[PDB]
Design an enzyme around this catalytic site. Structure first.
Site, PDB file in Angstrom:
ATOM      1  N   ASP A  34       0.798  -1.216   0.000  1.00 54.46           N
ATOM      2  CA  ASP A  34       0.000   0.000   0.000  1.00 54.46           C
ATOM      3  C   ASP A  34       0.838   1.276   0.000  1.00 54.46           C
ATOM      4  O   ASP A  34       1.319   1.699   1.050  1.00 54.46           O
ATOM      5  CB  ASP A  34      -0.917  -0.022   1.238  1.00 54.46           C
ATOM      6  CG  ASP A  34      -1.845   1.164   1.300  1.00 54.46           C
ATOM      7  OD1 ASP A  34      -1.967   1.864   0.285  1.00 54.46           O
ATOM      8  OD2 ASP A  34      -2.431   1.397   2.373  1.00 54.46           O
ATOM      9  N   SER A  92      -0.929  15.720 -11.894  1.00 58.12           N
ATOM     10  CA  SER A  92      -1.198  15.336 -13.265  1.00 58.12           C
ATOM     11  C   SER A  92      -1.456  16.599 -14.075  1.00 58.12           C
ATOM     12  O   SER A  92      -1.965  17.593 -13.558  1.00 58.12           O
ATOM     13  CB  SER A  92      -2.404  14.381 -13.300  1.00 58.12           C
ATOM     14  OG  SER A  92      -2.841  14.131 -14.619  1.00 58.12           O
TER      15      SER A  92
END
Length: 330
Positions: free
Chosen positions: A35, A199
């Site tokens: 994770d 992004s």
């Protein structure tokens, strides 16, 4: 040193991925959920409340000659899906794909919430976010990666998740045969303890690319792609019959649909998520309503590039003094 281990979807939907991890002496092999959005290595154990164990493989520190109680240490964690676990702490030898760390904090669960009990395939989590998020008290502990870093050939790990197929986590090296083209690296903020990056925008299907900054985290422990409501609405508007269902808890769509792809930007590069990756199947057995793999992050408080996004890429988690993230197509 390096390590290389195969990671395998737990079910037909790729709801999560498990990777075998050797703990203790002699080795006890547990299948852990790696994770990159948390920083605790915890396991089902001989200390876990019996009623809360249902099929998981447990770690029994009394059977490990290298286990030592970390006296006074406790841990307690809550995840974004509302699940939780807590317990005490041992140190022991932990190996992943041939890479060994001695003195790793192995957090032994005394309590786990229902979502963990009910998933017999996940024996625990191995956190790979920054150690500043680790929950051990009163002495915070380091992640497996942090402990391994200085021994690694290069201070990196990579995630290469498969779509309905096994993939690979590598530590200490970049497998140049595992991706196509070039890797595009982008800046990381560690201010919230995550692999947080920005992004450069998105496209829906064959549509034009929208240039827009989307801050989010690269999180292997989250199944879906969680993005701003504007973005998610633009995606689902291209699927006839798709709608957000408050009762189901997100966007659903007719199982008869063909889903468009979703593209996200990494600097001037583009990662294309095929439409099929965004299908999470019937909302209940036999339903013709299917759950979407792109969902709104509104009310999460953060955008999450989870497995739906990451599995479309070869992803480099560069843990150099100034960390960065790299994405390549594959």
């Amino acid at each position: 040193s390096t390590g290389s281990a195969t990671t395998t979807p737990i079910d037909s939907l790729d709801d999560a991925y498990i990777t075998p991890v050797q703990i203790g002496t002699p080795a006890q092999t547990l299948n852990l959920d790696f994770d990159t959005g948390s920083s605790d290595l915890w396991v089902f154990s001989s200390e876990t409340t019996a009623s809360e164990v249902d099929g998981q493989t447990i770690y029994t520190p009394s059977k490990s000659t290298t286990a030592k109680l970390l006296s006074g240490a406790t841990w307690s964690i809550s995840y974004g899906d509302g699940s939780s676990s807590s317990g005490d702490v041992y140190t022991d030898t932990v190996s992943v794909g041939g890479l060994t760390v001695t003195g790793q904090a192995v957090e032994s669960a005394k309590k786990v919430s229902s979502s963990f009990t009910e998933d017999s395939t996940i024996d625990g989590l191995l956190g790979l976010a920054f150690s500043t998020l680790n929950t051990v008290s009163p002495t915070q502990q380091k992640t497996f990666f942090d402990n391994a870093k200085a021994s690694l050939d290069s201070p990196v790990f990579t995630a290469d998740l498969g779509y309905h197929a096994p993939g690979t986590y590598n530590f200490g090296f970049i497998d140049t045969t595992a991706y196509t083209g070039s890797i595009t690296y982008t800046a990381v903020s560690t201010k919230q303890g995550f692999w947080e990056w920005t992004s450069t925008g998105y496209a829906v299907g064959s549509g034009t690319f929208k240039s827009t900054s989307i801050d989010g985290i690269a999180d292997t422990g989250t199944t879906l792609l969680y993005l701003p409501a504007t973005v998610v609405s633009a995606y689902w508007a291209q699927v006839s019959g798709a709608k957000s269902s408050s009762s189901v808890g997100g966007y659903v769509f007719p199982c008869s649909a063909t889903l468009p792809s979703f593209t996200f930007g990494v600097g001037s590069a583009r990662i294309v998520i095929p439409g099929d990756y965004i299908d999470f199947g019937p909302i209940s057995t036999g339903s013709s309503s299917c759950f979407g793999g792109i969902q709104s992050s509104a009310g999460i408080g953060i955008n999450i590039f989870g497995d739906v996004a990451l599995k479309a890429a070869f992803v480099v988690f560069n843990g150099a003094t100034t960390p960065t993230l790299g994405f390549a197509s594959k």
